[PDB]
Amino acid sequence: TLAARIAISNLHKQTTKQFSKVVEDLYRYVNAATGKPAPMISDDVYNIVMENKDKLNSAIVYDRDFQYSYFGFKTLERSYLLRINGQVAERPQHLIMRVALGIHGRDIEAALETYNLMSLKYFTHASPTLFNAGTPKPQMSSCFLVAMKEDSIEGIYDTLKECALISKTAGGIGLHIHNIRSTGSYIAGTNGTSNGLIPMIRVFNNTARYVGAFALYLEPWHADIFDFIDIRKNHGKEEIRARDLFPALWIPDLFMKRVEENGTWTLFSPTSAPGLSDCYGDEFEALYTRYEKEGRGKTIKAQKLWYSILEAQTETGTPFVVYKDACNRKSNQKNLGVIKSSNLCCEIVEYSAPDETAVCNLASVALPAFIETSEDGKTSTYNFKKLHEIAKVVTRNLNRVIDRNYYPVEEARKSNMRHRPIALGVQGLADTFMLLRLPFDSEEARLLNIQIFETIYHASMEASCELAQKDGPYETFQGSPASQGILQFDMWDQKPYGMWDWDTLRKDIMKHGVRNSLTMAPMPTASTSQILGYNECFEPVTSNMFQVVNPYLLRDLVDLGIWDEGMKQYLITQNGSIQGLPNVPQELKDLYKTVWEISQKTIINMAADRSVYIDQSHSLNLFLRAPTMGKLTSMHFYGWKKGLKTGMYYLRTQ
Amino acid sequence: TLAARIAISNLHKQTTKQFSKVVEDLYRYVNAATGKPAPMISDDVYNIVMENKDKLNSAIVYDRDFQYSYFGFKTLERSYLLRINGQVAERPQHLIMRVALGIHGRDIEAALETYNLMSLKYFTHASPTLFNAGTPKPQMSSCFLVAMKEDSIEGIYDTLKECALISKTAGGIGLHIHNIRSTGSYIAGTNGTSNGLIPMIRVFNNTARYVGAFALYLEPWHADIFDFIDIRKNHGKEEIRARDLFPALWIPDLFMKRVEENGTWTLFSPTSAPGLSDCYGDEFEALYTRYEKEGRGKTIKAQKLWYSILEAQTETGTPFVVYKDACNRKSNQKNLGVIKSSNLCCEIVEYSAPDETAVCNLASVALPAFIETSEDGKTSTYNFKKLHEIAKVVTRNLNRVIDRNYYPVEEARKSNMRHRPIALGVQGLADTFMLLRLPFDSEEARLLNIQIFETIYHASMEASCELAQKDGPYETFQGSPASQGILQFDMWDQKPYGMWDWDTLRKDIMKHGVRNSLTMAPMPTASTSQILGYNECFEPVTSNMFQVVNPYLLRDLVDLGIWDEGMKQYLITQNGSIQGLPNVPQELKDLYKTVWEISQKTIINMAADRSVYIDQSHSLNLFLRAPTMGKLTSMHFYGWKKGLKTGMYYLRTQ
């Protein structure tokens, strides 16, 4: 309330004004108890700041620190700001200037531009980038896609070592394991069987606790599939669980079909059925069927599996669902080979192999920051031209990061330097609709959703083409969909919406290439969108509220008189909902529909809409009343036929 | 009873007589369910057998199969004999012939000699050697001494990988970790502390379950010492335990002194106090003291630690105790550097480093097999000349193994090919005393103990010198104690007992060198001594008994009439003891004293006696009535001042 300005001003008093000196102190820092020099600034940036201190110092507007809300700021204080002896040594403006420097280096102009735009809350980078940009070993990447190196104790243990090295930095991990033999499989030069995936998973669970959570990806034909999906079950059978990892399903179309037509589904060990995961679509279904005929696996009723999956999803919120064929059919990285997993949050879709660990850097544009009253006043509209301009900057930022990143494992560096994937997202979609007074489920919200993503995708590809004009295309550009002028929406066999000129862009892409093989992967924004004060990513609100009420809701309630006590009381004891409320104008009830009150068919529709402008995928959480087995089935099947890549992230419940 | 000959004869009927054809089948074996060729014989041995089948086939005396006792044989059946489809395919004589071939290869003479001696129960090799000799990848080594590679996630994870690779074969492991930083130590490029050894130990616990148990060695100055010693406590605090690993203490003299004089004892993290474990004796105590002065650690009352250690030992039977300074002062491997651990069973004492994993092969001579009635009859004496002759063979066997072994990790191969350690032990010491009617605690038992070990040590060094005459000394012989003619007893500053000529031997050792840097490490015999029907290693009996009574006890009881029912009943309800029994001749009571009834001062004495003829160390289990804190202290301090290497293995209780 008045608490934010209390908390912030007190930071100002126990904090040196003058960025150049705070840099000096951070860089000079020394661990008191150990006597060890422990710089929190890189040599590289310290120097830059020193050779420019007056220019840097006077660019900072410390006014801007007061713009975070109490809980927003305390998020920064608790985690993001650099500490000395447990004492905050960084102002929010220092944080930002440092991050800018860590990205742009000697490009002072760009650095100030990034600074200004971030300080004004036009956009922000992901948490790893906020933590580490400008610091000695800047691990700024958020995502790592890891291939299980080989079905052996060496391969497994080499992979575990690699995950430890990754997770120790700020790295989230998606790990696919389709090549690990199942329970009871033969092991040369022994006499006892194999105990399958679960024990091996216990090992990874254990390494995560010791050290970036893990998601594990598995296709549903793997013989250990029934236990795998139940990892997070809290009525655990104990040594058969793994409460700290996440099951994600890598689902082929064939499975969905088998389920649908109430048919059979055969389980295999990778050893008995090689190559399943190194092909997709038709090639897979030809290979699959043959292995079925040849008796290599164990056939079941497909709907038994489907049923179990639903039971785990209902009970635990997992496994996630990501459709393997959508991902490979519609990836600009398909010239690299078959993609075998997504990531921790199911938005990244990139090629990984034993020698190549996929990496991504994330940033999110703040959608509401482009809302403005038109040339008159009776409106407030949306400035797609500014949105376009900022996306071009974020695209350049994210690309700079590729080069200035400290890579934890050589596999990650090899992978990223070759293909240069990038991932832009959004926060404040639900705010944006609310400021324009568009219900989430409305035809204008549907329209605006489409438009926003077309300009972000266009702008990013435009920035990226411009970069390829400067530095050449990424190593593997030749032979990709984009080199032919196939873009994301084309692969969904759709015409773009037309707000921007795609023909010219496509012309230059074919002529000059693009610096980045991918650019768009709407991610969970979480902590960053609490810093900025907006709603998570692209989702609607979960509730409109000695608590904190929705600000736009509040404005409206007050503006109509009906805000008071026997009123306030009503929302609290109604979990942020305003439906079935005695005296609220219908239009507010529709504008402030909470996600439990919005059709999921609508959610999926809009996801599908925007999906045509998404190089990769997006973290589609799904929300259910009291879940029902039939409703989940309808939900998944709707999204699958909608051609979604990520059919589901979490299944949020009740 | 008559059950053994029942069980054995039935094996004969479901088993092909003719070793050459059983080899054929094993070598031809194929996994029915998988269709995979799964040979259980190496190409190398299969061929040898084929080119000699008539010679091999007709050397086997299948009579000898009937000589194992029911429970002895069923030990072989349950674990040792090669199976086909869960069906025993090996006779005990095949097992042995195969093992012999796997060791000697094309040396058919030696192979038959090993066969004859083993089939007659003159000696046996350790279980890994019985499992794997002659098979495709023959991992015949029992012991692996592993250096923690480095205090980093890489080093730790590389070490874990290495232990997994080792433990997956038949390998037991001793792992020293004195270089791992403790709880709260600083970690460069992070903000949270270090959580110390216990979490890292949870990782190793977890890898042992997934895959050769682990013993972990730690010196008592390590800052995590109090939790480390409590690993096996069953009133666990849960995530602070590790119920599947064993704490062993690597104790410097300085600690014992500090305890003794009720003084201080300082704890360090390796990071704050480098080099502690890379020196010993005076060099250590100089370095230690300086770090004490310089305030680098946390000083305590030494007896607090001592007290806790006793509490864990009382409650769990661990930690084991192995005196680091005895081990380094009196090791022929001291020219290699400072020895940092023993092994899983506290008998191996060899140098290990990040690039060198110490390895050993074990065999045990059956002591009772050299007892014979003298040239007349009124005796039964001991044939030290035969004992000497057999030890020479076992020494040659164990040396052959060094060359024919498949090493699981390159570190192990590098280490063993350089130094060629060997480890001979014994079983049936308690039987031998009983057959000669010498109470364990008697002056003749004390004498015989000394003599037996002097000839085993002499014979082994003699065999080994002979081998060095054939093949040259081991790579690092020059500069060692032995190259100067210092032998084990010399390093205890004692004259040998004199039953064999040490001067000539020492002369030839100095002239020609020795093939093996070590030769003697009396180990737990366990399963092998149930196969052979004798008592474990060098320990006394634990009890003299719808059960099974001590055979020599029985002979005597019967021979005096007093054996019956109100008699039988008496031992059962007396846990194998015969003391305080109404009508037993005093001499039997002393001859059949159970280990709970034998003074531990005596045990330790004899250990010390034989210790002068032990290149390495021996697995000294200690046995207590109802333990007392003062008695344990007396026990340890007695052994320490006796100059024991392994002060204690398990603490057997009640």
Mutate: best of A85, A140, A153, partner B, most B CBs <10 A: A153
Q: What is the DSSP letter of A79?
A: I
Cα–Cα distance, A273 to A291 (Å, whole number): 7
Q: What is the DSSP string of B22-33?
A: HHHHHHH-EETT
CB B226 within 8 Å of CB B305 = yes
A interface residues, B as partner, C-beta within 8 Å: 31, 33-34, 36, 38, 83, 135-137, 153-154, 157-158, 160-161, 164-165, 168, 186, 188-189, 191, 199-200, 202-203, 206-207, 209-211, 272
User: How crowded is residue B102: how many other Cβ atoms within 10 Å of its Cβ?
Assistant: 26
Residue by residue, what is the 3-state secondary structure of A374-388? CCCCCCCEECHHHHH
Q: What is the DSSP letter of B145?
A: E
Q: Where are the alpha helices (DSSP H) in A3-152?
A: 3-13, 19-28, 43-50, 53-57, 70-75, 92-104, 108-119, 127-132
Residue by residue, what is the 3-state secondary structure of A589-617? HHHCCCHHHCCHHHHHHHHHHHHCCCCCC
Cα–Cα distance, A118 to A132 (Å, whole number): 16
Structure tokens at A506: 């496509």
Long-range contacts of A4-10 (CB under 8 A, 24+ apart): A4/A66, A4/A68, A4/A69, A4/A70, A4/A72, A4/A73, A5/A66, A7/A70, A7/A73, A7/A74, A7/A77, A8/A65, A8/A66, A8/A68, A8/A73
Length of chain B: 654
- Please, what sign has the CA dihedral across residues A217, A185, A271, B168? positive
CB A216 within 8 Å of CB A204 = yes
Exposed e or buried b per residue across B561-593, where buried means at least 16 C-beta atoms within 10 angstroms of its C-beta: eeeeeeeeebbeebebbbeeeeebeeebbbbbb
| Residue A168 labelled as part of a binding site | yes
Q: What is the DSSP letter of B353?
A: B
Mutate: best of A152, A157, A158, A198, partner B, most B CBs <10 A: A157
Cα–Cα distance, A570 to A589 (Å, whole number): 14
Does A189 contact B137 at a Cβ distance shorter than 8 Å?
A: yes
The CA distances from residue B531 to A21, A59, B576, in Å, are 77, 85, 21
Environment class of residue A107 by beta-carbon count within 10 Å: exposed (0-12), middle (13-18) or buried (19+)? middle
Does B210 contact A199 at a Cβ distance shorter than 8 Å?
A: yes
Domains (range + CATH), chain B: 1-654 (3.20.70.20)
CB A27 within 8 Å of CB A46 = yes
Query: What kind and span of H or E run contains B623?
Result: strand B622-624
Q: How many CA atoms lie within 13 A of A619 on its CB side?
A: 22
Cα–Cα distance, A514 to A522 (Å, whole number): 20
Those residues with Cβ within 8 angstroms of residue B451's Cβ, 6 or more apart along the chain or in another chain: B382, B384, B497, B499
Structure tokens at B453: 């070990």
Those residues with Cβ within 8 angstroms of residue B651's Cβ, 6 or more apart along the chain or in another chain: B313, B314, B317, B318, B621, B622, B624, B627, B632
Those residues with Cβ within 8 angstroms of residue A472's Cβ, 6 or more apart along the chain or in another chain: A513, A515
Smallest CA–CA distance, residue B166 to chain A, in Å, is 10
CB A217 within 8 Å of CB A341 = yes
Cα–Cα distance, A482 to A473 (Å, whole number): 11
Cα–Cα distance, A286 to A146 (Å, whole number): 27
Strand, helix or coil at B180? coil
Q: Which residues on B lie below 8 Å from A34 (Cβ)?
A: 186, 272
Smallest CA–CA distance, residue A532 to chain B, in Å, is 25
Number of helices and strands (H, E) in chain A? Answer: 27, 18
Query: What kind and span of H or E run contains B320?
Result: strand B320-323
Residue by residue, what is the 3-state secondary structure of B468-528? HHHHCCCCCCCCCCHHHCCCHHHHCCCCCCCCCCHHHHHHHHHHHCCCCCCCECCCCCCHH
Does B210 contact A202 at a Cβ distance shorter than 8 Å?
A: yes
Cα–Cα distance, B149 to B354 (Å, whole number): 5
Report which of A616, A583, A387 is spatially closest to residue A516, judged by C-alpha positions.
A616
Smallest CA–CA distance, residue A116 to chain B, in Å, is 29
Place of tokens 């006077």: A58
- Please, what sign has the CA dihedral across residues A214, A215, A219, A221? positive
**Could you tell me which chain A residue has the CA closest to the CA of B188?**
A38
**Could you tell me which chain B residue has the CA closest to the CA of A209?**
B199
Cα–Cα distance, A231 to A237 (Å, whole number): 10
Q: How many CA atoms lie within 13 A of B469 on its CB side?
A: 11
Structure tokens at A559: 């503006």
Structure tokens at B236: 């666990």
Mutate: best of B203, B209, B269, partner A, most A CBs <10 A: B203
- The experimental technique behind this entry is X-ray
Q: Which amino acid is at B302?
A: A
Structure tokens at A24: 């000096």
CA A41 distance to own-chain centroid: 27
Report which of A172, A239, A183, A247 is spatially closest to residue A206, judged by C-alpha positions.
A239
**Could you tell me which chain B residue has the CA closest to the CA of A33?**
B186
Q: Which residues on B lie below 8 Å from A38 (Cβ)?
A: 186, 188
- Please, what sign has the CA dihedral across residues A366, A369, A374, A379? positive
Strand, helix or coil at A94? helix
Q: Please provide the distance, in angstroms rounded to a whole number, between the alpha carbons at the two ends of chain A.
A: 31
Does B188 contact A160 at a Cβ distance shorter than 8 Å?
A: no
E-strand ranges in A337-467 read 358-360, 362-366, 371-372, 381-382, 423-427
Query: What kind and span of H or E run contains A299?
Result: strand A298-301
CB B322 within 8 Å of CB B248 = yes
Cα–Cα distance, A228 to A309 (Å, whole number): 10
Does A137 contact B209 at a Cβ distance shorter than 8 Å?
A: no
Q: What is the DSSP letter of A334?
A: G
**Which residues of B are part of a known binding site for dTTP?**
151-153, 168, 181, 188-189
Q: What is the DSSP string of A492-547?
A: TT----SSS-HHHHHHHHHHH--S-S--B-----THHHHHTT--STT---S-----
Cα–Cα distance, A148 to A180 (Å, whole number): 8
Q: How many CA atoms lie within 13 A of B198 on its CB side?
A: 20
Does B31 contact A200 at a Cβ distance shorter than 8 Å?
A: no
Closest CB from A38, A157, A186 relative to B160? A157
**In angstroms, what is the C-alpha Rg of chain A?**
25
Those residues with Cβ within 8 angstroms of residue B607's Cβ, 6 or more apart along the chain or in another chain: B618, B620, B639, B642, B644
Query: Resolution of this PDB entry, in A?
Result: 2.5
Residue by residue, what is the 3-state secondary structure of B552-620? HHHHHHHHCCCCCHHHHHHHHCCCCCCCCCCCCCHHHHHHCCCHHHCCHHHHHHHHHHHHCCCCCCCCC
Does B165 contact A154 at a Cβ distance shorter than 8 Å?
A: yes
Q: Which amino acid is at B207?
A: T
**Which residues of B are part of a known binding site?**
127, 142, 151-153, 168, 181, 188-189, 343, 347, 525-528
Mutate: best of A191, A272, A294, A296, partner B, most B CBs <10 A: A191
Does B157 contact A165 at a Cβ distance shorter than 8 Å?
A: yes
Strand, helix or coil at A129? helix
Q: Please provide the distance, in angstroms rounded to a whole number, between the alpha carbons at the two ends of chain B.
A: 31
Cα–Cα distance, B41 to B23 (Å, whole number): 7
Going by their DSSP bridges, the two strands A371-372 and A320-323 should be labelled as: unpaired
Does B164 contact A158 at a Cβ distance shorter than 8 Å?
A: no
Strand, helix or coil at B245? strand
Helix axes B281-293, B253-260, angle to 10 degrees: 60
- Nearest 10 degrees: Cα torsion B495, B496, B498, B499: 170
Going by their DSSP bridges, the two strands A298-301 and A264-267 should be labelled as: antiparallel
Q: Which amino acid is at A80?
A: Y
Q: Which residues pair with A125 in a beta bridge?
A: A363
Report which of A206, A216, A218, A145 is spatially closest to residue A181, judged by C-alpha positions.
A218
CA B649 distance to own-chain centroid: 10
Structure tokens at B582: 């109404």
Cα–Cα distance, B330 to A113 (Å, whole number): 71
CB A611 within 8 Å of CB A640 = no
Cα–Cα distance, B269 to B191 (Å, whole number): 18
Q: How many CA atoms lie within 13 A of B211 on its CB side?
A: 29
- Please, what sign has the CA dihedral across residues A400, A404, A405, A409? positive
Point out the residues of A that are catalytic. 343, 345, 347
